């Protein structure tokens, strides 16, 4: 109820017109500020109590950002495009020691997004579903977050079948990339904690805050 994909698309269009690891971390911190502005544009998100807004963003920021730079890289050959305007090529990541996770992003996310031609509206809805994660611990009202998630995938399904009537299994295909996004998001976080532990690789203030407890 009251979750038009038009508003979701606007949010997407509104927030985005030597060591690759350092560049990636720098791009993440930068995008964390934009993520907040993006979320505020997601219908009903700002109507939730501040505490729940913090919990949802802290719980999904990594998956939310991975989804964004992955879709942005659909045109890129073998690499990803950072929000900073730089490109991280597959070989560069490998030469930096993060080849394993990098290839998972290309194979499980980027490549798949390109093969099915995932559009910005679909991207937005998937990110909105992730944002409204009812399983996030500490939620004062998980039921309300649950209702909002259902409204999103309900509007997403409507969008599909209508925009792509020829592809009846598109809606399910979109949601079935979430498990891979969940797995890749966890691995990327593991690397970040290790980078912070080792000391190398500069980590900015907002990214650092996201690594804080819990």
């Amino acid at each position: 109820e009251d979750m038009p994909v038009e508003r979701i698309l606007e949010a997407e269009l509104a927030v985005e017109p030597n060591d690759p690891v350092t560049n990636i971390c720098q791009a993440a911190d930068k995008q964390l500020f934009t993520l907040v502005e993006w979320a505020k544009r997601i219908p009903h998100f700002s109507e939730l109590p501040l505490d729940d807004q913090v919990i949802l963003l802290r719980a999904g920021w990594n998956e939310l950002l991975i989804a964004s730079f992955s879709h942005r890289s659909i045109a890129v050959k073998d690499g990803i495009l950072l929000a900073t305007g730089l490109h991280v090529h597959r070989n560069s990541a490998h030469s930096a020691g993060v080849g394993a996770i990098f290839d998972r992003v290309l194979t499980e996310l980027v490549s798949k997004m390109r093969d099915m031609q995932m559009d910005k509206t679909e991207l937005g809805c998937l990110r909105a579903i992730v944002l409204f994660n009812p399983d996030s611990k500490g939620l004062s009202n998980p039921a309300e977050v649950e209702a909002l998630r259902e409204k999103v995938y309900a509007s997403l399904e409507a969008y599909c079948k209508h925009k792509y009537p020829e592809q009846p299994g598109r809606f399910a295909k979109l949601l079935l990339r979430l498990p891979a996004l969940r797995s890749i998001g966890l691995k990327c976080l593991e690397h970040l904690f290790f980078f912070k532990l080792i000391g190398d690789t500069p980590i900015d203030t907002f990214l650092m805050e996201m690594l804080e407890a819990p």
Partner: peptide, 11 residues
């Protein structure tokens, strides 16, 4: 706790 995030969401 979560100083930056709270401030940004509030404005």
């Amino acid at each position: 706790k979560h100083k930056i995030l709270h401030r940004l969401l509030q404005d």
